[PDB]
Amino acid sequence: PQITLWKRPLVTIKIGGQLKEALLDTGADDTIIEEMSLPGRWKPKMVGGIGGFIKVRQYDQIIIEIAGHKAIGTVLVGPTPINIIGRNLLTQIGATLNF
Amino acid sequence: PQITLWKRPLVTIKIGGQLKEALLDTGADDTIIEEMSLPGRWKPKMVGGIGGFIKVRQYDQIIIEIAGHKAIGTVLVGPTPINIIGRNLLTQIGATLNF
Numbered sequence: 415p416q417i418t419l420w421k422r423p424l425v426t427i428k429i430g431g432q433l434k435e436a437l438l439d440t441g442a443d444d445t446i447i448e449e450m451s452l453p454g455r456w457k458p459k460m461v462g463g464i465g466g467f468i469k470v471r472q473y474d475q476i477i478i479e480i481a482g483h484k485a486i487g488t489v490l491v492g493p494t495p496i497n498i499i500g501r502n503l504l505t506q507i508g509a510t511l512n513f
Numbered sequence: 514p515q516i517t518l519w520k521r522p523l524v525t526i527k528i529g530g531q532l533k534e535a536l537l538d539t540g541a542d543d544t545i546i547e548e549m550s551l552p553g554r555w556k557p558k559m560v561g562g563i564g565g566f567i568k569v570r571q572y573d574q575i576i577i578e579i580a581g582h583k584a585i586g587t588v589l590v591g592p593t594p595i596n597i598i599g600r601n602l603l604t605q606i607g608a609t610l611n612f
């Protein structure tokens with residue numbers, strides 16, 4: 415796909431057996447999803463942005479289908495106002511910025 | 514250019530005659546720069562990010578060069594942790610997301 419940026423670049427993802435919508439975010443180092451359960455081990459992390467930091471759970475080796483493209487990587491889970499696909503998984507689907 | 518996402522997509526910007534670095538951020542509606550002086554009047558705006566909201570100064574019709582492309586548009590100034598180029602100016606320089 416080529417995605418213009420006139421509106422937010424929202425896509426459908428599948429994670430943990432659940433379909434969700436998420437923002438493709440080149441400004442995010444990491445992927446962060448709103449509170450949900452995921453299997454396996456986790457460790458606590460703080461992640462910071464505009465407005466300050468939030469505490470999240472870091473799960474490693476989680477598979478996510480992103481607009482029909484599979485990726486595996488770390489997923490943070492916590493009180494983010496929107497689900498965000500960050501660079502750690504955007505690389506894996508071959509996403510690039512073009513101008 | 515075609516910019517991969519293995520590293521942060523940082524580019525040089527020029528605003529008020531000064532070179533700065535900024536992040537190309539598809540997850541940002543709005544361009545926001547760290548504190549600096551800009552001409553004209555400003556308007557109030559609240560910006561909500563991962564960690565809560567911040568107050569910023571909204572300047573309209575500001576001339577800004579981004580990675581060698583000319584844009585003229587709205588720039589917010591406030592305590593962002595990093596200079597960010599959001600979709601309002603990414604559209605002006607013709608940027609798309611591709612995968």
Ligand SMILES: CC(C)CN(C[C@@H](O)[C@H](Cc1ccccc1)NC(=O)O[C@H]1CO[C@H]2OCC[C@H]21)S(=O)(=O)c1ccc(N)cc1
Pocket residue numbers: 439440441442443444445446461462463464495496498500538539540541542543544545560561562563564594595597599
């Ligand atoms: C601020 C950037 C350096 C980092 N952010 C990614 C960014 O794209 C967020 C992503 C985002 C989007 C919506 C709400 C919260 C965060 N956008 C954002 O805060 O933009 C604000 C300015 O324009 C506005 O439009 C969106 C909210 C405003 S972040 O959400 O804090 C974040 C930080 C670290 C990770 N790993 C993942 C995400």
Ligand SMILES: [Cl-]
Pocket residue numbers: 486487488502503
């Ligand atoms: Cl990862």
Ligand SMILES: [Cl-]
Pocket residue numbers: 557558568
């Ligand atoms: Cl104010």
Ligand code: NA
Pocket residue numbers: 453454455473474475476
């Ligand atoms: Na795991």
